[PDB]
Amino acid sequence: HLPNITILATGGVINAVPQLKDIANVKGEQVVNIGSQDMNDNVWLTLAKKINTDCDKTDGFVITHGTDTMEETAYFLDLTVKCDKPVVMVGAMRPSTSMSADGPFNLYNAVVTAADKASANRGVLVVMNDTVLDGRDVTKTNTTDVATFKSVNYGPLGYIHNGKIDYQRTPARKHTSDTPFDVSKLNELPKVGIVYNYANASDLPAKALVDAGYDGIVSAGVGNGNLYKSVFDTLATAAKTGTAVVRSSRVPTGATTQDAEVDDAKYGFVASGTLNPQKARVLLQLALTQTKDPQQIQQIFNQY
Amino acid sequence: HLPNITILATGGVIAGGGVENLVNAVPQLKDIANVKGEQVVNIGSQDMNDNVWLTLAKKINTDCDKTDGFVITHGTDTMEETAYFLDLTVKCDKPVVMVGAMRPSTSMSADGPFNLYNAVVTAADKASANRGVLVVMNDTVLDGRDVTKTNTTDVATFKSVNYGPLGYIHNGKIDYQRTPARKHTSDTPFDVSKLNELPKVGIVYNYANASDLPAKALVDAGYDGIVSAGVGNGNLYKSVFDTLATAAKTGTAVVRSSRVPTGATTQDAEVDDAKYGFVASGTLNPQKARVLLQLALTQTKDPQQIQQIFNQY
Amino acid sequence: HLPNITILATGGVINAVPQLKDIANVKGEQVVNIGSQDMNDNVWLTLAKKINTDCDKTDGFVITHGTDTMEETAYFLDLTVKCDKPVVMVGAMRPSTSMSADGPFNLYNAVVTAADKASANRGVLVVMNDTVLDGRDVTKTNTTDVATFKSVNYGPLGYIHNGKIDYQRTPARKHTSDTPFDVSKLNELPKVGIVYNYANASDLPAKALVDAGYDGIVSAGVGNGNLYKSVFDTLATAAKTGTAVVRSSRVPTGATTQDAEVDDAKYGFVASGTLNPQKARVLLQLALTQTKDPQQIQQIFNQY
Amino acid sequence: HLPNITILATGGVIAGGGVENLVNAVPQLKDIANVKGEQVVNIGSQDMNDNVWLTLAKKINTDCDKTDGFVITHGTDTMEETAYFLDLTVKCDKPVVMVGAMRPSTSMSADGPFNLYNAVVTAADKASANRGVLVVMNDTVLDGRDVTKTNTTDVATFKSVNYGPLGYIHNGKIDYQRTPARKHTSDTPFDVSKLNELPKVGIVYNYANASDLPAKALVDAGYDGIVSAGVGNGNLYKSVFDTLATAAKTGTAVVRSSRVPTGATTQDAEVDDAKYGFVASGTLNPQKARVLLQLALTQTKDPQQIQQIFNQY
Ligand SMILES: N[C@@H](CC(=O)O)C(=O)O
Ligand SMILES: N[C@@H](CC(=O)O)C(=O)O
Ligand SMILES: N[C@@H](CC(=O)O)C(=O)O
Ligand SMILES: N[C@@H](CC(=O)O)C(=O)O
């Protein structure tokens, strides 16, 4: 009578939750054990492969992860997982040995989410603080708050009360099996770096990446993806010299749009829309497995 | 008797689609002030830089006695940075109010006119004094330390995301209910009157699989400081951590901030600052932490004194 | 080549926008002229009838309205409009004669929204401050701010930049032609009143309504729809005496849930979910045109 | 030397699923204070009332010299109301900190334990003094006037939605950056030491097609005041307006507030307060405007003096 749920563990600050046995038959597997500040491409490749391979062995997946880069992993899996069963990511803001630790109830709600049949076909989900959040818009909004995880542009899909979810939204951007990114045979990802804009910004980070032959650069622009003059110069050069350039923003909400202050087509640049720099990096890496044409990368940025 | 208010124009979308045309665009300003304008520069704030900052702060400090208040018209993109620099360096204790516009003056429902008006109202209010340098946008008075641009296009983008606004503006009047506690203006030791340049401080971003090359480049270039835009509570990808540990043992100041948009990068978390000679930025986001680090480095290179400065200002 | 758009005007603080001619052939009609603080049942009946009757005469509707009760009208139309062409509501926070008045660009964006073919089948929409918001979750969050209108539980559907909308969400709750509420032959609505909970609350408002024979009472509860003891007593009486009782909350976000501190089935009560008191009142009035069974009213509250 | 901190328990979900079991539930409290507990009542705060308010305020004022700080355990539902009443009536200038819990103590990841701890930390901090009565929830210190419950179930529900929090709590320490400007505690004229009851003030809601019957009922009952939960900027449906106009001309105090969850109900908007003898509530939401109106009516019935009180406190 209960669903089969596989917990895949990666570490982070998050048996000790026996009330799980009320809602699913849980099996645990250690994939890695790291703080997610050391999250990397290899871990991501491992996770997508495991999920895709093991899909027909379970009814859903919960991935325990650190909270620091949970938002990057959730979007990577959102674009590469082809399993059409729920994949829910979860962490904790307080250690398990601390007073009023969030990990037990968080895990419980993540299992609830992975077990719910209404959760399929919603893409990869993050479940934190009683809320089901899509892997594309979810981000860490505060450095220490238990309520930190929000979908700051388009909102949560669902709230969880008493083990039940009232879903009122689903992401429209294409995800999972509706994307072309197939990661099954890949052992590395294209090299993509992020540079930060501010007053009197150095061009040296952007130059270091270009000198290294990086495949992509994401700018964390000011305002609507704007670039400090030295940084602009160096990127405009990179984009005609073999490096794809995506303009995002350091600004924590809203789109980096087309048709603002930057002639994207003149420079061969791509506007990130609502993807923040770390998220744009995810979709840039995957675009680069398929194309290096900035027109075609911009299309990818317009659909996923 | 109306107050005398000086507008110092620097450019931005508010001056776009100089200063003398701005005033004539808002004649209602004559109802609340005698306004006089000076163009200091005319740049997009994406191109703001240490020299415009020194020029403004020197100018305000020099011209303090000649006016009753200052309004700075400025691009939105880096207004939060300029605001905090001026907050630490102006010694004038007449109000200094920054203002921009998120829509072009020629566009429908342009926010520039009513924003300017409100910035003047604020600079004319005797209660605006002794609150530090201010940002006035969308009917709201915001302190220069906490104010940040939250959204890429919304007219309401500017928010003090941790501690809230100082006061709200309705029908040309302000109900002030808050003032920043952190020391500002004439309570800081920072004196830029005889400074021709600022120490070099760069910013590096942290994410999964972060490259150390951007950090290495800034070390190779002999940077006086580096501000880390960390993950979560000021955390660093290992490669980045390692370059920044090595740098701090050879006299580069290293301040851990966070790419996360609200909350403090705290002391006593996952990083042993005292061990590496790193500084925790508190609620200062990376571009704000740069502002303070640059000024910290005019006084001191000691990591412990620099930490004390990040606890007071 | 341009869409036919009918502006229906009701008043509020919001020709003078000639740039409309770039995006549609606009026709205006005065239905009423009031401040929306005097919005009433008759105006709503008029509006739904007009839209339904005139549906095949236009490509979309923009309704100009005051901002005070725009959120109540948008949900009423959201449940009663059977036209499957966009119906967009719009107002202004600043008078048209004031500096940097929001009405021109707001109207422009509302027309953009009503003209967009992607806007059909999304229910009744409110467009304010560059944002397309669903009529069920949208509410006035601040007394004076131009950015006041937000969908505070589930987020916007879409942002508008340079005359274009990137839609990433649509409401899941049933709306428009997927609801049973047919208003075409009705000339009045069931009488529904709202009472407020706080410390030491008087039962006198609730009693006045009951004494008046009201069909429904919405409680603006404390917390998770809780009721001051005197008010609870009076409502528990009303619910067994011919008055339907819906528990909402004065709290501006989140659900009044089932299975919390109030035994709803014991008392014959209905939990409002995410509907605030004014919105619950809308759906209560319409439920009462079809049923007075609290089990069946609770179902309606669970689907619309 | 640890400080002496008194917990006054009133009930709520934190005391649920008295006071002596609460302490034993949080033994770590012994690391930061000598705690002593008194049960004052044991009710859900949905049932909070004028008598519990008088009892708490009298008690705190009486017992001020016998302890170093007070923590009040309380239901979440009306904590914002109690907090503001105590903010206007306690004359003790040791910290007074309110705390509840949104999950039951028996539930997974119960917030009650760590909340209590933080409330004690706050009440023990000498810097918490002279800031008025405080609410401590979700690692955040909030002033009693602005604090409100924003969400029906979230552990982070409590926010000062207009002017922000006072300070944040990390590893048992507080960085205070704000204090309320509005007069509180020993700067208010409100003295409830010899009061056996409070004036009668009710709340009426405004929406489309609003009934006047709830307003009429409160007038018929001879209410001393009525607080309107208005639409938008304190506006009233016509029937409601008319009953409340008639009432104010026969000595009922009428305060326009707003059902809208942030922002002020302003003077000089669509309602001519001076004409009807109405008062504008400012940022006080309806349940908060009641708190102040009740206390205003212990001093005065004049609409103009009551307006002045709504501008100062
Ligand atoms: N540094 C931790 C933070 C957490 O899990 O809260 C991690 O992300 O692995
Ligand atoms: N790029 C412009 C943006 C603005 O003014 O809104 C600037 O910062 O100068
Ligand atoms: N009282 C006006 C408010 C507005 O339109 O801004 C109305 O709702 O009609
Ligand atoms: N109904 C409870 C809610 C809580 O404590 O969270 C109370 O206010 O007493």
PDB file of N, CA and C in Angstrom, chain B residues 66-108:
ATOM      1  N   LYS B  66      27.426  76.573   1.746  1.00  0.00           N
ATOM      2  CA  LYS B  66      26.851  77.384   0.700  1.00  0.00           C
ATOM      3  C   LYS B  66      25.427  76.974   0.322  1.00  0.00           C
ATOM      4  N   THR B  67      24.907  75.918   0.938  1.00  0.00           N
ATOM      5  CA  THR B  67      23.563  75.468   0.607  1.00  0.00           C
ATOM      6  C   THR B  67      22.876  74.837   1.824  1.00  0.00           C
ATOM      7  N   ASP B  68      21.562  74.589   1.742  1.00  0.00           N
ATOM      8  CA  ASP B  68      20.857  73.896   2.859  1.00  0.00           C
ATOM      9  C   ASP B  68      20.688  72.376   2.716  1.00  0.00           C
ATOM     10  N   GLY B  69      20.981  71.845   1.523  1.00  0.00           N
ATOM     11  CA  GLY B  69      20.845  70.425   1.231  1.00  0.00           C
ATOM     12  C   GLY B  69      21.280  70.114  -0.187  1.00  0.00           C
ATOM     13  N   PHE B  70      21.616  68.837  -0.418  1.00  0.00           N
ATOM     14  CA  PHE B  70      22.108  68.318  -1.696  1.00  0.00           C
ATOM     15  C   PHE B  70      21.206  67.174  -2.151  1.00  0.00           C
ATOM     16  N   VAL B  71      20.880  67.204  -3.442  1.00  0.00           N
ATOM     17  CA  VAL B  71      20.244  66.093  -4.120  1.00  0.00           C
ATOM     18  C   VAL B  71      21.225  65.613  -5.211  1.00  0.00           C
ATOM     19  N   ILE B  72      21.554  64.334  -5.276  1.00  0.00           N
ATOM     20  CA  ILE B  72      22.422  63.814  -6.345  1.00  0.00           C
ATOM     21  C   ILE B  72      21.599  63.033  -7.322  1.00  0.00           C
ATOM     22  N   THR B  73      21.488  63.483  -8.567  1.00  0.00           N
ATOM     23  CA  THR B  73      20.810  62.654  -9.583  1.00  0.00           C
ATOM     24  C   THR B  73      21.839  61.624 -10.141  1.00  0.00           C
ATOM     25  N   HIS B  74      21.437  60.364 -10.335  1.00  0.00           N
ATOM     26  CA  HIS B  74      22.370  59.252 -10.487  1.00  0.00           C
ATOM     27  C   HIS B  74      21.640  58.086 -11.145  1.00  0.00           C
ATOM     28  N   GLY B  75      22.397  57.339 -11.936  1.00  0.00           N
ATOM     29  CA  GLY B  75      21.943  56.052 -12.481  1.00  0.00           C
ATOM     30  C   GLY B  75      21.498  55.085 -11.368  1.00  0.00           C
ATOM     31  N   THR B  76      20.517  54.265 -11.667  1.00  0.00           N
ATOM     32  CA  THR B  76      20.037  53.307 -10.675  1.00  0.00           C
ATOM     33  C   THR B  76      20.976  52.162 -10.408  1.00  0.00           C
ATOM     34  N   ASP B  77      21.785  51.778 -11.411  1.00  0.00           N
ATOM     35  CA  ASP B  77      22.502  50.527 -11.396  1.00  0.00           C
ATOM     36  C   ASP B  77      23.490  50.441 -10.243  1.00  0.00           C
ATOM     37  N   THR B  78      24.224  51.519  -9.977  1.00  0.00           N
ATOM     38  CA  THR B  78      25.170  51.496  -8.861  1.00  0.00           C
ATOM     39  C   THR B  78      24.894  52.560  -7.781  1.00  0.00           C
ATOM     40  N   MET B  79      23.710  53.196  -7.808  1.00  0.00           N
ATOM     41  CA  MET B  79      23.298  54.146  -6.767  1.00  0.00           C
ATOM     42  C   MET B  79      23.544  53.617  -5.371  1.00  0.00           C
ATOM     43  N   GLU B  80      23.281  52.347  -5.132  1.00  0.00           N
ATOM     44  CA  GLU B  80      23.513  51.816  -3.765  1.00  0.00           C
ATOM     45  C   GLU B  80      24.969  51.857  -3.309  1.00  0.00           C
ATOM     46  N   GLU B  81      25.878  51.844  -4.278  1.00  0.00           N
ATOM     47  CA  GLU B  81      27.315  51.853  -4.017  1.00  0.00           C
ATOM     48  C   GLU B  81      27.757  53.285  -3.700  1.00  0.00           C
ATOM     49  N   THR B  82      27.409  54.214  -4.576  1.00  0.00           N
ATOM     50  CA  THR B  82      27.694  55.639  -4.352  1.00  0.00           C
ATOM     51  C   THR B  82      27.120  56.138  -2.996  1.00  0.00           C
ATOM     52  N   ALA B  83      25.844  55.846  -2.799  1.00  0.00           N
ATOM     53  CA  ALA B  83      25.154  56.155  -1.545  1.00  0.00           C
ATOM     54  C   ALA B  83      25.945  55.741  -0.328  1.00  0.00           C
ATOM     55  N   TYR B  84      26.519  54.516  -0.308  1.00  0.00           N
ATOM     56  CA  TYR B  84      27.268  54.011   0.864  1.00  0.00           C
ATOM     57  C   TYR B  84      28.651  54.653   0.978  1.00  0.00           C
ATOM     58  N   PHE B  85      29.281  54.924  -0.169  1.00  0.00           N
ATOM     59  CA  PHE B  85      30.554  55.621  -0.138  1.00  0.00           C
ATOM     60  C   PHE B  85      30.362  57.007   0.472  1.00  0.00           C
ATOM     61  N   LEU B  86      29.405  57.727  -0.033  1.00  0.00           N
ATOM     62  CA  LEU B  86      29.106  59.087   0.487  1.00  0.00           C
ATOM     63  C   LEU B  86      28.672  59.081   1.964  1.00  0.00           C
ATOM     64  N   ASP B  87      27.888  58.056   2.327  1.00  0.00           N
ATOM     65  CA  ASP B  87      27.505  57.795   3.720  1.00  0.00           C
ATOM     66  C   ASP B  87      28.735  57.703   4.654  1.00  0.00           C
ATOM     67  N   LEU B  88      29.896  57.210   4.166  1.00  0.00           N
ATOM     68  CA  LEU B  88      31.073  57.022   5.012  1.00  0.00           C
ATOM     69  C   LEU B  88      32.057  58.187   4.962  1.00  0.00           C
ATOM     70  N   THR B  89      31.888  59.057   3.960  1.00  0.00           N
ATOM     71  CA  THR B  89      32.859  60.084   3.683  1.00  0.00           C
ATOM     72  C   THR B  89      32.371  61.505   3.724  1.00  0.00           C
ATOM     73  N   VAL B  90      31.058  61.772   3.647  1.00  0.00           N
ATOM     74  CA  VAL B  90      30.638  63.171   3.736  1.00  0.00           C
ATOM     75  C   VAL B  90      30.638  63.590   5.182  1.00  0.00           C
ATOM     76  N   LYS B  91      31.147  64.777   5.394  1.00  0.00           N
ATOM     77  CA  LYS B  91      31.239  65.286   6.749  1.00  0.00           C
ATOM     78  C   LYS B  91      30.258  66.396   6.920  1.00  0.00           C
ATOM     79  N   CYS B  92      29.569  66.756   5.851  1.00  0.00           N
ATOM     80  CA  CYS B  92      28.575  67.777   5.909  1.00  0.00           C
ATOM     81  C   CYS B  92      27.367  67.244   6.659  1.00  0.00           C
ATOM     82  N   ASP B  93      26.792  68.058   7.539  1.00  0.00           N
ATOM     83  CA  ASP B  93      25.584  67.584   8.235  1.00  0.00           C
ATOM     84  C   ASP B  93      24.353  68.412   7.815  1.00  0.00           C
ATOM     85  N   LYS B  94      24.259  68.544   6.498  1.00  0.00           N
ATOM     86  CA  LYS B  94      23.050  68.871   5.858  1.00  0.00           C
ATOM     87  C   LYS B  94      22.716  67.618   5.065  1.00  0.00           C
ATOM     88  N   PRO B  95      21.433  67.419   4.802  1.00  0.00           N
ATOM     89  CA  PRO B  95      21.057  66.186   4.124  1.00  0.00           C
ATOM     90  C   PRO B  95      21.638  66.047   2.739  1.00  0.00           C
ATOM     91  N   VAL B  96      22.016  64.827   2.413  1.00  0.00           N
ATOM     92  CA  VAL B  96      22.458  64.449   1.115  1.00  0.00           C
ATOM     93  C   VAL B  96      21.528  63.329   0.622  1.00  0.00           C
ATOM     94  N   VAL B  97      20.841  63.574  -0.473  1.00  0.00           N
ATOM     95  CA  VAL B  97      19.784  62.636  -0.986  1.00  0.00           C
ATOM     96  C   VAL B  97      20.073  62.230  -2.407  1.00  0.00           C
ATOM     97  N   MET B  98      20.174  60.922  -2.653  1.00  0.00           N
ATOM     98  CA  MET B  98      20.403  60.402  -4.007  1.00  0.00           C
ATOM     99  C   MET B  98      19.059  60.029  -4.638  1.00  0.00           C
ATOM    100  N   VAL B  99      18.937  60.164  -5.967  1.00  0.00           N
ATOM    101  CA  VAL B  99      17.698  59.838  -6.650  1.00  0.00           C
ATOM    102  C   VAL B  99      18.017  59.431  -8.111  1.00  0.00           C
ATOM    103  N   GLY B 100      17.344  58.415  -8.621  1.00  0.00           N
ATOM    104  CA  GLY B 100      17.313  58.154 -10.035  1.00  0.00           C
ATOM    105  C   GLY B 100      15.918  57.891 -10.478  1.00  0.00           C
ATOM    106  N   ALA B 101      15.827  57.314 -11.688  1.00  0.00           N
ATOM    107  CA  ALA B 101      14.593  56.917 -12.314  1.00  0.00           C
ATOM    108  C   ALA B 101      14.803  55.604 -13.045  1.00  0.00           C
ATOM    109  N   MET B 102      13.863  54.741 -12.911  1.00  0.00           N
ATOM    110  CA  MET B 102      13.862  53.446 -13.644  1.00  0.00           C
ATOM    111  C   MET B 102      13.222  53.463 -15.013  1.00  0.00           C
ATOM    112  N   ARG B 103      12.329  54.395 -15.280  1.00  0.00           N
ATOM    113  CA  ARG B 103      11.889  54.660 -16.655  1.00  0.00           C
ATOM    114  C   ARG B 103      12.503  55.981 -17.230  1.00  0.00           C
ATOM    115  N   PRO B 104      12.704  56.003 -18.563  1.00  0.00           N
ATOM    116  CA  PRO B 104      13.115  57.213 -19.217  1.00  0.00           C
ATOM    117  C   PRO B 104      12.107  58.352 -19.131  1.00  0.00           C
ATOM    118  N   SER B 105      12.608  59.560 -18.960  1.00  0.00           N
ATOM    119  CA  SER B 105      11.769  60.744 -18.860  1.00  0.00           C
ATOM    120  C   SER B 105      10.784  60.893 -20.012  1.00  0.00           C
ATOM    121  N   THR B 106      11.133  60.382 -21.182  1.00  0.00           N
ATOM    122  CA  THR B 106      10.222  60.443 -22.315  1.00  0.00           C
ATOM    123  C   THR B 106       9.196  59.361 -22.333  1.00  0.00           C
ATOM    124  N   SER B 107       9.337  58.369 -21.465  1.00  0.00           N
ATOM    125  CA  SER B 107       8.430  57.237 -21.494  1.00  0.00           C
ATOM    126  C   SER B 107       7.166  57.569 -20.737  1.00  0.00           C
ATOM    127  N   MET B 108       6.077  56.896 -21.117  1.00  0.00           N
ATOM    128  CA  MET B 108       4.822  56.929 -20.388  1.00  0.00           C
ATOM    129  C   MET B 108       5.079  56.603 -18.898  1.00  0.00           C
TER     130      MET B 108
END
